[PDB]
Amino acid sequence: GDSKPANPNYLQGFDIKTKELLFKRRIDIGGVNNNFKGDFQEAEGLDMYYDLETGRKALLIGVTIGPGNNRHHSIYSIGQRGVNQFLKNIAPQVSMTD
């Protein structure tokens, strides 16, 4: 992904054994409707969380949508059923009151 929302990012998955192109997609991660905080969709890597309890893999990606020095750090996921719920329900977000 480029450091601006004009050049749309791309996640491309493909088999390694055959050296092919299985698929590639555009994804609007962060601000909805391509309306980010300013104009800075600097992409960032991603990994695969494997919960030891269920054994359900879950891809999750990082993104920054923050303008200028002010950087945001948002996380999205393409996981299966039961992983994203669990990841959010581990512990709650911060808040002024409990």
Partner: protein, 49 residues
């Protein structure tokens, strides 16, 4: 399979994050940013952020 928000990150560094790993054994995030110099820093932090 359109994505789903998970969480938001609150490191103490004013630089663009460059990698992001989660620890399934303890539910802790390791978040690598590149500092103004060549050097870099990885912040270890909580599941919420």
């Amino acid at each position: 399979q359109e994505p789903e928000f998970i969480t938001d990150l609150s490191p103490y560094t004013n630089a663009v994050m460059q990698s992001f790993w989660v620890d399934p054994r303890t539910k802790i995030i390791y978040m690598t940013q590149a500092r103004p110099g060549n050097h870099y820093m990885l912040s270890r932090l909580k599941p919420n952020g």
